[PDB]
């Protein structure tokens, strides 16, 4: 009737009567709701609706908000599609010293509007089709329709008309510098170079005026890299090849660690003989990892400047990138030079900790904390305490993973519900608009997966599908489904072309979509790798490896700019806290101080956090910048996270800071995160820093032929760590020739 059983658990299929717990706060109450009833999609778009996309505002707003199909910005309006390009004169870098914020952004302008000869009063714009990274938007007014196909990484906008023809409208007359009849090269008054393409024989009119017109029912617009007729000619070759399908297909080669992704379009010809291909604009995270076999397709001098640095052109049907998956661990092992009794004391202190709210996020942070403590308790010989922590995880998960109470009725809180309208699992109590905007399902549910993975590491029976595994697998499907999932859209959170996850379900902002904590995304991917390995689910594991590895490539470019190529020279900080489609901010979604605008991209610390140490010069540069701004090592908040980060390159410094301040205050206090951030513990902090002191630096130059491992290097001496989730012993080969044997359900070293 009102819930569906899944193993021992269930999810609600009717919206529950929420138990507000007597809380009257309207913000809290408004969070316990559902996403919008109205979805702006045509009847060609059926099944679970895609969310968390760069283009999402088209589906939620009657028209759209401003979007960033780089290299363009566009927005839908009743009058037509506005097109813009941020030139250098449009870009700014601003600091608000009092707020401690910085902002890199452009403008919300209009270079021209793509219009329909029959109407400038469209009723709405709907999603009419989409694929892995393009969308087809359909402006509708009865018989008058204008379908616009565009995408991130497409320097084309394809325009198809019904019951009318093409118009390009400008506020100031453009310079048409090349007039080939059906093809024109033009510039805005402020020298932005574009081109427009119609079928042969359909000639452009209005040249020299503010309005360029064409009788064709098909045109394409291109952003040109330069005012160059040879480039115009190249763009003409693919201007009639409209992208209909676009897939990012991947493989993981376990032996080598290589994740290979092939981006492939399928086009429809708008003139006879049009080739099956396009011109792609690649982002830095792509072209820096371009496969050898794709290099011949590069259009070398075809560059575009955007918020994310320089894009480059590449022609054809497909291209391929190659990345290296570095491994993850379930925990750091027991290899530190800590006082073990001191660590035991901290493990017991952590029983005083409790969740600071009833919503999925705060509960998530608490269950991640317990799951992090349990392996450390095992290591220290506090085996009943470890069991206490895992028992508490079981109690919490077995509660949340059941939608019905003892009577068989729906619960009012601590449950999951399937919103059928969009096709998404929502958890109540909700927060951060996880339900009302379909936000942050990776951030929140990643913590539930961590809890499950720690349980599964000790208890395979609990994790079976028919027990509690089916419900965990349902949560994972919500945020990272494979194709043809009957309940959920494909890879909800992830944008395979932009290379990152997008946190906002709706994307109804004029900067496009955003992501703040890239580290909470990486945490989700880590935990699925661990869960899938524990439960023997190779396909799921490999999908999470692809996500972890790809997201890592985007983080190092756009959040960290490890290569010192992307952020403008005048931008002071050494991190971007929030990446948007259209802008970059050193700022947080809540009111914070200096440390948090860095550390929200570090936390939480866990066995998959070692990607943060791959670039020791970056780690040093970022730490030194934050230290400069603070003016000392008196961290304003979350001191433990700064010490843990510092330990990637200078564990002696990290240790002395920790010794000086870690016991400044006593047991868990929600009002005071000066020393210990509320998702962290003293025990975790002390264990982490001492392990890094013994291990040295992360060594990303060595891979292995199994996925659960790490390699460190201290002055040329390597330490190899492997965790084996199997009932059988394994042998692991490392790429430097080293081999080890690992016993069932253990680390090779430091089991403790
Ligand atoms: O130390 C005491 C203080 O601790 C703070 O908790 C921190 C916590 O807020 C932080 O959360 C992260 C979230 O920012 C992030 O979630 C984002 C949403 O918050 C955001 O919502 C916006 C909304 O702010 C705005 O008003 O309206 C928008 C719609 O118009 C709406 O979208 O949306 C983002 C996506 O667009 C979304 O990602 O993600 C995670 C939570 O889901 C968190 O990473 O996390 C910190 C670290 O755990 C916390 O310390 C409290 O907030 C303060 O009140 C306390 O005083
Ligand atoms: O200082 C003490 C108080 O601090 C507060 O925290 C501050 C925090 O709220 C602030 O969050 C920033 C967001 O406000 C910002 O959101 C922007 C959107 O508002 C904007 O929306 C527009 C919409 O206004 C317009 O009508 O329609 C447009 C669509 O057509 C729509 O886009 O969208 C922007 C993106 O397009 C969006 O950025 O987003 C920032 C990140 O980019 C947030 O940082 O941040 C401050 C700095 O960290 C915080 O100080 C607390 O909440 C208070 O309780 C304290 O009293």
Query: How open is the CA angle 46-50-52, to the nearest 5 degrees?
Result: 165
How many angstroms does the Cα of residue 494 sit away from the middle of ligand 2? 23
Q: Are 534 and 461 in contact (CB under 8 A)?
A: no
DSSP code string of 505-540: SS--STT--EES-HHHHHHHHHHHHHHHHHTT-HHH
Ligand 2 pocket member 329 (CB < 6 A): no
Ligand 2 pocket member 61 (CB < 6 A): no
Ligand 1 pocket member 673 (CB < 6 A): yes
Q: Are 743 and 713 in contact (CB under 8 A)?
A: no
CA of residue 483 relative to chain centroid, distance = 18
Residue 714: beta bridge partners? 717
Q: Which CATH class is domain 56-245?
A: mainly beta
| Cβ neighbours, 10 Å, residue 671 | 7
Residue 130: beta bridge partners? 135
Q: Which residues contact 319 (CB under 8 A, 6 or more apart)?
A: 262, 263, 280, 282, 286, 290, 291, 294, 297
Dist CA 622 CA 158 (whole Å): 42
Phi and psi at residue 385, in whole multiples of 5°? -65, -45
**281, 297, 314: which is closest to 151 by C-alpha?**
281
Q: Is the dihedral of CA 116, 118, 121, 122 positive or negative?
A: negative
Identify the experimental approach: X-ray
Collapsing DSSP to helix, strand or coil, 391 comes out as helix
Nearest CA to ligand 1 atom 19: 432
DSSP code string of 233-296: HHHHHTTTEEEEEEEEEEEEETTTTEEEEEEEEEEEESSTT--S-EEEEE-HHHHTTB-GGGGG
Q: Spell out a b/e string for 166-203, using b for 16 or more CB atoms within 10 Å of the CB, else e.
A: bbbbbeeebebeeebebbbbbbbeeebbbbbbbbeebb
- Residue 482 host element (H or E): none
| Cβ neighbours, 10 Å, residue 53 | 29
The beta strands (E) that lie in 508-655 are given as 514-515, 578-580, 583-586
Collapsing DSSP to helix, strand or coil, 419 comes out as strand
Q: Are 68 and 582 in contact (CB under 8 A)?
A: yes
How far does the chain reach from its first CA to its final CA, in angstroms? 50
How many angstroms does the Cα of residue 589 sit away from the middle of ligand 2? 7
Ligand 1 pocket member 516 (CB < 6 A): yes
Ligand 2 atom with minimal separation from the 57 CA? 29
The residue count of the chain comes to 752
Q: Are 377 and 685 in contact (CB under 8 A)?
A: no
Dist CA 227 CA 178 (whole Å): 10
In 649-700, where does DSSP find H-type helix? Answer: 651-661, 682-695
Nearest bound ligand to CA 524?
1
Q: Are 102 and 585 in contact (CB under 8 A)?
A: yes
Q: Which residues contact 294 (CB under 8 A, 6 or more apart)?
A: 314, 318, 319, 320
Q: Long-range contacts for 408-411 (Cβ within 8 Å, ≥24 apart)? A: 410/2, 410/3, 410/12, 410/14, 410/16, 410/17, 411/16, 411/19
Phi-psi region of 715 (alpha: psi -120 to 50; beta: other; left: phi over 0): left
Q: Are 430 and 359 in contact (CB under 8 A)?
A: yes
To 10 degrees, what angle do helices 538-554 and 518-534 make? 160
Positions of chain breaks in the chain, given as the residue before each break (C to N > 2.5 Å): none
| Cβ neighbours, 10 Å, residue 38 | 11
Residue 746: beta bridge partners? 724
Collapsing DSSP to helix, strand or coil, 4 comes out as strand
Nearest bound ligand to CA 68?
2
Dist CA 530 CA 598 (whole Å): 27
Percent of the chain as helix, strand, coil, to the nearest 5? 30, 25, 45
Secondary structure letter of residue 501 according to DSSP: B
Nearest bound ligand to CA 444?
1
Whether the link from the prior residue into 71 is cis, omega within 30° of 0, is yes
Q: Are 131 and 153 in contact (CB under 8 A)?
A: no
The beta strands (E) that lie in 60-100 are given as 73-77, 80-84, 92-96
Mutate which of 369, 433, 641, 673 for ligand 1? The one with the most ligand atoms within 8 Å of its CB, which is 433
Ligand 1 pocket member 518 (CB < 6 A): no
Ligand 2 pocket member 507 (CB < 6 A): no
Q: What is the resolution of this structure in A?
A: 1.7
Ligand 2 atom with minimal separation from the 512 CA? 36
Q: Are 338 and 687 in contact (CB under 8 A)?
A: yes
């Amino acid at each position: 009737m009102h819930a569906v059983s899944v193993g021992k658990g269930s999810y609600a299929t009717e919206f529950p009567e929420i138990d507000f717990g007597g809380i009257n706060d309207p913000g809290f109450r408004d969070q316990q709701g559902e996403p919008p009833a109205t979805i702006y999609r045509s009847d060609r778009v059926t099944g679970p609706m895609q969310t968390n996309s760069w283009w999402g505002s088209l589906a939620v707003d009657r028209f759209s908000m401003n979007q960033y199909p780089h290299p363009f910005s566009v927005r839908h309006r009743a009058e037509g599609l506005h097109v813009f390009y941020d030139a250098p004169h449009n870009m700014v870098v601003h600091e608000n010293r009092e707020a401690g914020t910085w902002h890199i952004h452009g403008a919300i302008g209009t270079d021209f509007t793509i219009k329909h000869s029959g109407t400038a009063n469209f009723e709405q714009a709907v999603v009419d089709d989409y694929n892995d990274w393009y969308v087809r938007g359909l402006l509708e007014n009865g018989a008058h329709q204008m379908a616009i196909t565009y995408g991130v990484g497409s320097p084309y906008i394809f325009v198809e008309y019904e019951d009318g023809s093409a118009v390009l409208d400008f506020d100031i007359a453009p310079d048409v510098w090349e007039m080939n009849g059906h093809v024109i090269g033009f510039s805005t008054h402020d020298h932005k170079h574009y081109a427009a393409f119609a079928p042969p024989g359909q000639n452009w009119s209005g040249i020299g005026s503010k309005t360029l017109t064409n009788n064709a029912d098909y045109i394409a617009i291109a952003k040109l890299p330069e005012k160059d007729g040879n480039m115009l000619a190249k763009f003409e070759q693919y201007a009639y090849s409209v992208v209909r399908d676009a897939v990012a297909d991947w493989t993981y080669d376990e032996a080598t660690g290589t994740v290979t992704t092939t981006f492939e379009v399928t086009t429809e010809a708008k003139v006879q003989g049009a080739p099956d291909g396009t011109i792609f604009a690649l982002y830095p995270h792509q072209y820096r990892h371009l496969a050898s076999s794709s290099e011949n397709q590069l259009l070398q001098n075809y560059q575009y400047e955007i918020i994310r640095g320089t894009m480059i052109g590449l022609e054809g049907k497909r291209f391929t990138t190659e990345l290296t998956y570095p491994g993850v661990l379930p925990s750091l092992p027991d290899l530190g030079d800590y006082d073990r009794e001191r660590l035991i004391g901290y493990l017991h202190d952590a029983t005083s900790d409790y969740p600071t709210g009833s919503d999925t996020y705060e509960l998530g942070k608490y269950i991640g904390k317990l799951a992090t403590l349990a392996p450390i308790a095992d290591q220290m010989g506090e085996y009943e305490l470890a069991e206490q922590f895992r028992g508490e995880l079981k109690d919490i998960l077995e509660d949340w993973l059941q939608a019905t109470n003892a009577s068989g009725q729906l619960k009012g809180k601590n449950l999951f519900y399937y919103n059928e309208n969009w096709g998404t699992i929502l958890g109540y109590h909700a927060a951060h608009s996880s339900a009302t905007r379909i936000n942050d399902h990776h951030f929140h549910y990643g913590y539930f997966v961590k809890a499950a993975a720690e349980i599964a590491r000790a208890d395979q029976e609990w994790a079976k599908s028919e027990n509690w595994g089916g419900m965990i697998d349902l949560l994972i499907r919500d945020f990272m489904a494979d194709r043809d999932d009957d309940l959920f859209p494909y890879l909800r959170m992830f944008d395979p072309y932009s290379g990152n996850s997008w946190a906002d379900g709706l994307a109804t902002f004029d900067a496009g979509n955003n992501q703040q904590s890239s580290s909470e995304a990486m945490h989700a991917w880590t935990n699925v790798i661990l869960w899938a390995e524990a439960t023997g689910n190779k396909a799921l594991r490999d999908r999470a490896i692809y996500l972890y590895t790809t997201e890592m490539s985007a983080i190092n470019e756009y959040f960290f700019d490890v290569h010192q190529e992307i952020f403008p020279e005048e931008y002071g900080p050494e991190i971007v806290t929030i990446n948007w489609g259209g802008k970059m901010d050193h700022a947080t979604w809540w009111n914070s101080g200096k440390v948090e605008k860095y550390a929200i991209n570090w936390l939480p610390f866990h066995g998959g956090s070692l990607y943060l140490g791959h670039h020791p010069d970056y780690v040093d540069r970022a730490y030194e910048e934050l230290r400069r701004d603070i003016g000392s090592t008196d961290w304003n908040l979350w001191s433990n996270l700064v010490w843990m980060y510092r330990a990637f390159t200078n564990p002696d410094d990290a240790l002395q800071q920790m010794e000086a301040s870690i016991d400044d205050y006593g047991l868990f206090d929600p009002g005071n995160e000066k020393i210990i951030e509320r998702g962290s513990t003293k025990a975790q902090t002390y264990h982490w820093i001492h392990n890094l002191a013994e291990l040295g630096r992360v060594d990303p130059t060595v891979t292995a032929n199994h996925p659960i491992y790490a390699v460190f290097n201290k002055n040329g001496n390597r330490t190899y760590i492997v965790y084996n989730f199997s009932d059988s012993p394994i042998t692991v080969q490392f790429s430097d020739g080293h081999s080890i044997q690992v016993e069932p359900h253990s680390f090779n070293i430091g089991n403790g």
